[PDB]
């Protein structure tokens, strides 16, 4: 039979194993071996240290599956709309296939977020009469979205940028229009060779950029990423659609991928196993044969016996690839081998994304204190439309965004009310990291060896809780001393995605890359080594996808490999929806 | 005889060799072997790719030693005052011993810097007339220095913090006063377990922090480093003294260390060799015996045969130590060895500093355009503190500070006029890095393999030059369209210190560390490993010193090792000058 070896039981790896079995590529007698460094709870309460999988982690208050929860990783999806060809098609199809469509609910955001900017409190609808305190004439009386759309249109000009295919084409062929007005960037410049922040800064000045970075929505990415992709993903014609979540958490999707793959494997006679607490240590090729070593979670740097497979999936992000590549980079490898991850073209293409650090603080309260009548600046979570919403509130602080989940349980547990506090960006990673150790304690774990998110959300220190409460007091009262009015959380925990093995909350395409060429060619890295024998060793996950903010991109890269390198029939309608960009 | 093996011919490694020979520790029949990854010009024109050494690099315009220059790395020092016992003692003694004291000149800074903040132009002397555009009442009418001094006093209370000894003791034992007024931090908290930015932000709010970060002097430092050390180094009572530089460049210190060591070694019968384009690849211990491999610069990841020495100095910063540790971390090491750099206590103490990325753009103009009579906001380089000065101009832009060196040429007929543009901090690294590749081109070198500073200042792209001129136009004209008024530079080059092998402009002691214990014990890392045989393997350099901004710290740690582990008589008077903190 045929053995399929998957390293990483995150979304991409789990989706791959589920498609191989349910799509009927793995037949009776075949083997699927999934290896996961972490110890996720696939088999109910007590079967792991946190719910699955990777950067998706639903966290229930007190670890009570009947309680309110906060998504401590990825939190929402965009429902596929086939009449518009927009939304997370594989996520929507997979939820339906797993029998979970009945649990899909709206994730509603306020039309009138509170903005806390340079010590001013401005509800977004009021900007026409209370201009934002940024020296950016015109733009400061409009939501930041108006400035995003304006900058996008200065970059895209008259180019069609409405469909997914047109957007893909702009990544490679998009040029600044003949009308581009700049001292720095000539008209006709290749937009994919421009940094988004660099050109936003050129066109709107530091105050226009800072206003957009401080007051913009969650989904508009202002880091210095590929300007071609940034323009089409932040503009008027950016992909959109209805935001949804899975009632009871996103993690159940990954529990069901695993359990349904195992039930289908039993019916098909396929040997499907998950081996947790076990990492890929090193990988290399001998012609088409993938050689690899495993390491235990207890001793992650020491490899075991050399194993072989004809089919290997590296279902793991850049920082995780880096740790595997480090294990052979400096080694004296066997004669006739190819140290594939350290080949020059593979290392170059792996740098086709930049990294954004993220930290999430999850706080449960015994009452929804933010709704009290005497709160000076409450979040506007009701009407402004009709349904109830989760916020956010948006600020120029380290605590850059707040979501208010409240009691999102089925109502049978003792009511707790959840708040998600978001810290992001290179600017702030060093700010938040020192809050992770108690003020009475020295650091004990070397930072690059603290695999905190891999194990599960970590108890918030008293310093971290107090800092969050200070920032929420400034947001909702305008007085740091009001932190005394906020009740102490009944539970507070954090996920710091900058730590290994994740090394990032998010990846974004880099400037000075041909995005489509990286998306196409990085998946089978032997293609980036001139003269190499093809091998079925693949790189999959959201990082080198066309949907980097989303589980969708993990599923799409995995699907693209099954289609292109295993000849499988896709479950998607790709007519108007390329899984990854073509060049 | 006795062999001394030094890895890294930066300031620390060169100083070590010089002291070993000129102090008479190495005697006739001994050997000193220095290995350097780079290829520095120690022997005049044609002898390397840039002037020595490490993060000190004088850059002459057009590679003309008679032209104006700009320090493309470290630029100034504090002259030792033995009467007050204040300043950079070893740097001053070394310049004197090398015969370079007659090249020492004042490095003067304006007492009335131009501030460009949130699109407003304010000369610092006029903040009473035109308050800084930050919502920080009182603080915004005073120089940022006042706020720095106020915060330091809130942290230090009545603790004496004027002497090196007392500053060292504050790192380990210093506590917030009983009067500390904070929601986040209790009175009496250990200041060394607090992040400086965390507590600044707590006490002064985001607008007070942002004003200090944007408008503070060059030496001011708001990163989230150890609050005990930050309070005593940012306070009214920070280490002071008269700022100087070496006319003709700081690099000639390092040329002269090498040449004079070689001459002295030849007179003494010591074999002194510098082998460049050759790096330490891997290091480990067998009892007291230092085992190592070298790699060529051409093939930096492939080690040669195992070599041994009894005396080894790792004269290289954290990111450089990290690359050497990576080469054994994942290896199956020989029987009876100690993989010293990957020992738990060594890895923990190596994380006792955080890193600050820095980028320097050096621009030479054919005329001092900033002095022209029609310039709306010229720098006040002439009068206010009596003699002429180099600036700076201070801004809230990515281009955070400007220095104006002008014509410092020594005998050209066609002098040029130099400008130093500084970009720093984790916030901006991704902003400046995309300017490093031409707008017509894709990236070609993997970012972690682009050893740019090692080679030498790189030609600025046209996009980088235009960005700097745009920022200088906004600063000096308040009109981005005035960029057309600035003459195109004769030469523009950059040094990005975030790149390997440096991985930082600067290191700063971290929160949640006992600074003194790390300073003392990291130097001989076998002392951090229970059961290990002691070995003469040392870690030296600025990063784990008590003078992290400065060459002084490289010399002090190197001096401390020669005194503590080789029984050498110090050249310093340590009466009021501990080389490193004592515990
Ligand atoms: C703060 C945050 C918010 C998000 N919000 C959303 C959202 O609202 N909706 C959404 O759809 N997406 C969201 N995402 C993105 C989503 O989390 C990712 O797209 C998705 O988790 C990517 O899946 P992946 O399988 O590619 O990688 P990962 O989730 O990173 O999984 C990789 C797996 O590989 C394992 N691994 C690593 N190294 C090894 C090794 N050597 N051997 C074996 N196993 C290894 C890891 O432990 C992990 O389990 C968010 C992400 C973050 C961080
Ligand atoms: C922007 C900037 C401004 C500064 N301003 C000042 C200032 O005004 N005044 C001042 O006094 N100081 C200043 N400094 C600091 C000064 O540059 C440093 O303190 C000093 O260079 C540190 O010397 P070092 O020997 O510890 O390390 P480095 O200068 O980093 O030298 C280490 C050496 O080790 C080599 N190396 C690395 N890995 C290996 C390997 N595996 N094998 C062999 N060799 C290896 C490197 O190539 C390098 O030559 C500044 C620094 C920067 C970046
Ligand atoms: N995926 C993140 C942010 C959205 C980014 C979209 N560009 C979340 O919804 O939690
Ligand atoms: N080395 C700097 C001092 C500050 C460095 C730390 N950011 C100088 O030239 O004065």
mmCIF file of C-alpha atoms in Angstrom, chain A residues 118-120 133 135 171-172 181-186 189-190 192-195 197-199 201-202 205-207 210 223-224 226 279 281 293 300-304 322-324 326-333 339 342 344 347-348 351 354-357 396-399 426-449 462-467 469-471 474 480-481 483-484 488 510-515, chain B residues 118-120 133 135 171-173 182-186 189-190 192-195 197-199 201-202 205-207 210 223-224 226 279 281 293 300-304 322-324 326-333 339 342 344 347-348 351 354-357 396-399 426-449 462-467 469-471 474 480-481 483-484 488 510-515:
data_model
loop_
_atom_site.group_PDB
_atom_site.id
_atom_site.type_symbol
_atom_site.label_atom_id
_atom_site.label_comp_id
_atom_site.label_asym_id
_atom_site.label_seq_id
_atom_site.Cartn_x
_atom_site.Cartn_y
_atom_site.Cartn_z
ATOM 1 C CA UNK A 118 -4.769 60.323 21.687
ATOM 2 C CA UNK A 119 -6.879 60.440 24.920
ATOM 3 C CA UNK A 120 -10.080 61.379 22.944
ATOM 4 C CA UNK A 133 -6.978 64.103 16.685
ATOM 5 C CA UNK A 135 -3.182 66.251 11.544
ATOM 6 C CA UNK A 171 -0.166 40.791 -7.576
ATOM 7 C CA UNK A 172 2.099 40.028 -10.564
ATOM 8 C CA UNK A 181 1.748 61.478 -7.943
ATOM 9 C CA UNK A 182 4.890 60.851 -5.861
ATOM 10 C CA UNK A 183 8.423 62.016 -5.248
ATOM 11 C CA UNK A 184 9.335 58.439 -4.253
ATOM 12 C CA UNK A 185 7.497 56.025 -6.599
ATOM 13 C CA UNK A 186 7.283 56.680 -10.341
ATOM 14 C CA UNK A 189 6.207 51.068 -10.849
ATOM 15 C CA UNK A 190 5.506 47.376 -10.125
ATOM 16 C CA UNK A 192 4.384 44.044 -5.861
ATOM 17 C CA UNK A 193 7.875 45.601 -5.388
ATOM 18 C CA UNK A 194 6.517 48.330 -3.050
ATOM 19 C CA UNK A 195 5.957 48.133 0.694
ATOM 20 C CA UNK A 197 3.281 51.102 4.620
ATOM 21 C CA UNK A 198 6.077 52.796 2.612
ATOM 22 C CA UNK A 199 3.599 53.926 -0.111
ATOM 23 C CA UNK A 201 3.195 56.913 4.232
ATOM 24 C CA UNK A 202 4.353 58.549 0.922
ATOM 25 C CA UNK A 205 1.920 61.263 5.383
ATOM 26 C CA UNK A 206 2.779 59.925 8.840
ATOM 27 C CA UNK A 207 -0.444 61.356 10.329
ATOM 28 C CA UNK A 210 -1.002 56.593 11.914
ATOM 29 C CA UNK A 223 2.037 46.405 8.013
ATOM 30 C CA UNK A 224 4.779 46.901 5.347
ATOM 31 C CA UNK A 226 3.248 43.593 -0.576
ATOM 32 C CA UNK A 279 7.707 16.445 16.260
ATOM 33 C CA UNK A 281 13.102 16.935 13.917
ATOM 34 C CA UNK A 293 13.805 11.942 12.075
ATOM 35 C CA UNK A 300 12.628 18.164 21.000
ATOM 36 C CA UNK A 301 16.195 18.744 19.686
ATOM 37 C CA UNK A 302 17.360 15.097 19.631
ATOM 38 C CA UNK A 303 16.299 12.977 16.682
ATOM 39 C CA UNK A 304 15.525 9.265 16.636
ATOM 40 C CA UNK A 322 12.837 27.246 10.331
ATOM 41 C CA UNK A 323 13.304 24.969 13.396
ATOM 42 C CA UNK A 324 13.289 21.849 11.168
ATOM 43 C CA UNK A 326 18.085 24.437 11.519
ATOM 44 C CA UNK A 327 18.550 20.705 12.349
ATOM 45 C CA UNK A 328 20.306 20.020 8.990
ATOM 46 C CA UNK A 329 21.633 23.495 7.977
ATOM 47 C CA UNK A 330 24.989 22.992 9.748
ATOM 48 C CA UNK A 331 25.165 19.182 9.453
ATOM 49 C CA UNK A 332 27.420 16.944 7.312
ATOM 50 C CA UNK A 333 24.678 15.166 5.360
ATOM 51 C CA UNK A 339 19.038 19.127 2.236
ATOM 52 C CA UNK A 342 18.164 24.759 3.124
ATOM 53 C CA UNK A 344 18.893 28.568 -1.759
ATOM 54 C CA UNK A 347 15.085 29.608 1.664
ATOM 55 C CA UNK A 348 14.462 32.595 -0.648
ATOM 56 C CA UNK A 351 11.092 34.667 2.955
ATOM 57 C CA UNK A 354 6.713 38.782 6.635
ATOM 58 C CA UNK A 355 5.540 37.963 10.140
ATOM 59 C CA UNK A 356 3.193 39.851 12.472
ATOM 60 C CA UNK A 357 3.375 38.976 16.186
ATOM 61 C CA UNK A 396 -4.149 53.746 19.674
ATOM 62 C CA UNK A 397 -2.916 51.877 22.802
ATOM 63 C CA UNK A 398 -0.870 48.684 23.035
ATOM 64 C CA UNK A 399 -4.311 47.125 23.748
ATOM 65 C CA UNK A 426 6.365 44.418 15.967
ATOM 66 C CA UNK A 427 6.034 47.744 17.767
ATOM 67 C CA UNK A 428 4.425 46.089 20.797
ATOM 68 C CA UNK A 429 5.804 42.512 21.117
ATOM 69 C CA UNK A 430 8.482 43.595 23.668
ATOM 70 C CA UNK A 431 5.838 45.580 25.596
ATOM 71 C CA UNK A 432 3.594 42.587 26.212
ATOM 72 C CA UNK A 433 6.283 39.916 26.727
ATOM 73 C CA UNK A 434 7.481 41.242 30.117
ATOM 74 C CA UNK A 435 3.855 41.073 31.450
ATOM 75 C CA UNK A 436 4.006 37.250 31.019
ATOM 76 C CA UNK A 437 6.265 36.702 34.099
ATOM 77 C CA UNK A 438 5.205 37.543 37.633
ATOM 78 C CA UNK A 439 6.606 40.798 39.061
ATOM 79 C CA UNK A 440 8.144 38.755 41.929
ATOM 80 C CA UNK A 441 9.965 36.317 39.566
ATOM 81 C CA UNK A 442 12.932 36.129 37.229
ATOM 82 C CA UNK A 443 12.551 34.521 33.791
ATOM 83 C CA UNK A 444 13.080 30.738 34.021
ATOM 84 C CA UNK A 445 12.523 29.493 30.401
ATOM 85 C CA UNK A 446 14.654 30.703 27.492
ATOM 86 C CA UNK A 447 12.191 32.721 25.317
ATOM 87 C CA UNK A 448 12.782 30.674 22.117
ATOM 88 C CA UNK A 449 11.988 27.438 24.079
ATOM 89 C CA UNK A 462 -1.483 39.891 38.221
ATOM 90 C CA UNK A 463 0.619 42.541 36.382
ATOM 91 C CA UNK A 464 -0.932 41.496 33.027
ATOM 92 C CA UNK A 465 -4.498 41.576 34.446
ATOM 93 C CA UNK A 466 -3.920 44.964 36.022
ATOM 94 C CA UNK A 467 -2.468 46.408 32.804
ATOM 95 C CA UNK A 469 -7.889 46.654 33.468
ATOM 96 C CA UNK A 470 -5.917 50.007 33.413
ATOM 97 C CA UNK A 471 -6.249 50.163 29.606
ATOM 98 C CA UNK A 474 -8.937 54.551 30.061
ATOM 99 C CA UNK A 480 -6.885 55.191 34.772
ATOM 100 C CA UNK A 481 -8.170 55.322 38.438
ATOM 101 C CA UNK A 483 -9.721 50.435 36.961
ATOM 102 C CA UNK A 484 -10.906 50.001 40.618
ATOM 103 C CA UNK A 488 -11.507 41.311 38.961
ATOM 104 C CA UNK A 510 6.285 40.445 1.206
ATOM 105 C CA UNK A 511 7.173 43.221 -1.207
ATOM 106 C CA UNK A 512 9.754 42.257 -3.875
ATOM 107 C CA UNK A 513 8.125 38.859 -4.501
ATOM 108 C CA UNK A 514 6.081 37.478 -7.389
ATOM 109 C CA UNK A 515 3.308 36.186 -5.090
ATOM 110 C CA UNK B 118 2.558 65.313 14.298
ATOM 111 C CA UNK B 119 3.169 67.701 11.321
ATOM 112 C CA UNK B 120 4.198 70.572 13.663
ATOM 113 C CA UNK B 133 0.926 68.176 20.057
ATOM 114 C CA UNK B 135 -2.294 65.275 25.150
ATOM 115 C CA UNK B 171 19.741 46.735 39.399
ATOM 116 C CA UNK B 172 19.626 43.838 41.895
ATOM 117 C CA UNK B 173 17.922 45.263 45.007
ATOM 118 C CA UNK B 182 0.027 52.669 40.518
ATOM 119 C CA UNK B 183 -2.906 50.382 39.738
ATOM 120 C CA UNK B 184 -0.445 47.968 38.112
ATOM 121 C CA UNK B 185 2.670 47.915 40.324
ATOM 122 C CA UNK B 186 2.609 47.643 44.143
ATOM 123 C CA UNK B 189 8.076 45.909 43.766
ATOM 124 C CA UNK B 190 11.507 44.787 42.483
ATOM 125 C CA UNK B 192 14.451 44.789 37.809
ATOM 126 C CA UNK B 193 11.294 42.667 37.279
ATOM 127 C CA UNK B 194 9.440 45.586 35.591
ATOM 128 C CA UNK B 195 9.649 46.600 31.933
ATOM 129 C CA UNK B 197 8.003 51.013 28.823
ATOM 130 C CA UNK B 198 5.329 49.137 30.819
ATOM 131 C CA UNK B 199 5.925 51.348 33.870
ATOM 132 C CA UNK B 201 3.150 53.932 30.161
ATOM 133 C CA UNK B 202 1.488 53.207 33.540
ATOM 134 C CA UNK B 205 -0.085 57.383 29.859
ATOM 135 C CA UNK B 206 0.268 56.592 26.143
ATOM 136 C CA UNK B 207 0.558 60.307 25.225
ATOM 137 C CA UNK B 210 4.744 58.712 22.883
ATOM 138 C CA UNK B 223 12.260 50.306 24.828
ATOM 139 C CA UNK B 224 10.768 47.792 27.303
ATOM 140 C CA UNK B 226 14.951 46.435 32.639
ATOM 141 C CA UNK B 279 34.086 32.015 11.126
ATOM 142 C CA UNK B 281 31.033 27.245 12.988
ATOM 143 C CA UNK B 293 35.041 23.796 13.777
ATOM 144 C CA UNK B 300 29.502 29.476 6.279
ATOM 145 C CA UNK B 301 27.337 26.529 7.382
ATOM 146 C CA UNK B 302 29.845 23.700 6.625
ATOM 147 C CA UNK B 303 32.462 23.012 9.295
ATOM 148 C CA UNK B 304 35.907 21.599 8.757
ATOM 149 C CA UNK B 322 22.869 32.038 18.385
ATOM 150 C CA UNK B 323 24.215 31.033 14.924
ATOM 151 C CA UNK B 324 27.079 29.036 16.536
ATOM 152 C CA UNK B 326 22.368 26.354 16.173
ATOM 153 C CA UNK B 327 25.165 24.209 14.697
ATOM 154 C CA UNK B 328 25.199 21.805 17.673
ATOM 155 C CA UNK B 329 21.643 22.216 19.141
ATOM 156 C CA UNK B 330 20.193 19.412 16.960
ATOM 157 C CA UNK B 331 23.420 17.345 16.584
ATOM 158 C CA UNK B 332 24.234 13.922 18.051
ATOM 159 C CA UNK B 333 27.348 15.013 19.878
ATOM 160 C CA UNK B 339 27.360 21.346 24.245
ATOM 161 C CA UNK B 342 22.952 25.006 24.471
ATOM 162 C CA UNK B 344 19.860 25.444 29.902
ATOM 163 C CA UNK B 347 20.581 29.737 27.030
ATOM 164 C CA UNK B 348 18.613 31.409 29.869
ATOM 165 C CA UNK B 351 18.198 35.911 26.967
ATOM 166 C CA UNK B 354 16.588 42.326 24.472
ATOM 167 C CA UNK B 355 17.526 43.645 21.016
ATOM 168 C CA UNK B 356 16.920 46.986 19.367
ATOM 169 C CA UNK B 357 17.182 47.011 15.529
ATOM 170 C CA UNK B 396 8.074 61.289 15.160
ATOM 171 C CA UNK B 397 8.738 59.810 11.684
ATOM 172 C CA UNK B 398 10.415 56.537 10.747
ATOM 173 C CA UNK B 399 13.433 58.856 10.223
ATOM 174 C CA UNK B 426 11.079 47.107 16.322
ATOM 175 C CA UNK B 427 8.191 49.307 15.077
ATOM 176 C CA UNK B 428 10.121 50.377 11.941
ATOM 177 C CA UNK B 429 12.391 47.453 10.921
ATOM 178 C CA UNK B 430 9.858 46.112 8.379
ATOM 179 C CA UNK B 431 9.337 49.697 7.085
ATOM 180 C CA UNK B 432 13.006 50.244 6.223
ATOM 181 C CA UNK B 433 13.849 46.727 4.995
ATOM 182 C CA UNK B 434 11.753 46.939 1.801
ATOM 183 C CA UNK B 435 13.663 50.139 0.827
ATOM 184 C CA UNK B 436 16.848 48.008 0.574
ATOM 185 C CA UNK B 437 15.850 46.329 -2.756
ATOM 186 C CA UNK B 438 15.417 48.250 -5.994
ATOM 187 C CA UNK B 439 11.745 48.889 -6.945
ATOM 188 C CA UNK B 440 12.392 47.135 -10.284
ATOM 189 C CA UNK B 441 13.641 43.919 -8.646
ATOM 190 C CA UNK B 442 12.614 40.933 -6.555
ATOM 191 C CA UNK B 443 14.539 39.938 -3.427
ATOM 192 C CA UNK B 444 17.448 37.594 -4.335
ATOM 193 C CA UNK B 445 19.165 36.868 -0.947
ATOM 194 C CA UNK B 446 17.324 35.216 1.934
ATOM 195 C CA UNK B 447 17.030 37.897 4.623
ATOM 196 C CA UNK B 448 18.785 35.884 7.386
ATOM 197 C CA UNK B 449 21.758 35.240 4.959
ATOM 198 C CA UNK B 462 16.846 55.239 -5.542
ATOM 199 C CA UNK B 463 13.633 54.497 -3.567
ATOM 200 C CA UNK B 464 15.574 54.709 -0.250
ATOM 201 C CA UNK B 465 17.237 58.038 -1.254
ATOM 202 C CA UNK B 466 13.897 59.528 -2.377
ATOM 203 C CA UNK B 467 12.236 58.398 0.913
ATOM 204 C CA UNK B 469 14.802 63.273 0.883
ATOM 205 C CA UNK B 470 10.945 63.282 1.246
ATOM 206 C CA UNK B 471 11.318 63.044 5.053
ATOM 207 C CA UNK B 474 8.892 67.574 5.456
ATOM 208 C CA UNK B 480 6.767 67.085 0.838
ATOM 209 C CA UNK B 481 6.943 68.726 -2.653
ATOM 210 C CA UNK B 483 11.998 67.287 -1.907
ATOM 211 C CA UNK B 484 12.792 68.571 -5.434
ATOM 212 C CA UNK B 488 20.587 64.555 -5.144
ATOM 213 C CA UNK B 510 15.938 42.626 30.111
ATOM 214 C CA UNK B 511 13.316 42.795 32.860
ATOM 215 C CA UNK B 512 13.023 39.696 35.059
ATOM 216 C CA UNK B 513 16.820 39.243 35.274
ATOM 217 C CA UNK B 514 19.403 39.783 38.022
ATOM 218 C CA UNK B 515 21.672 41.922 35.797
#
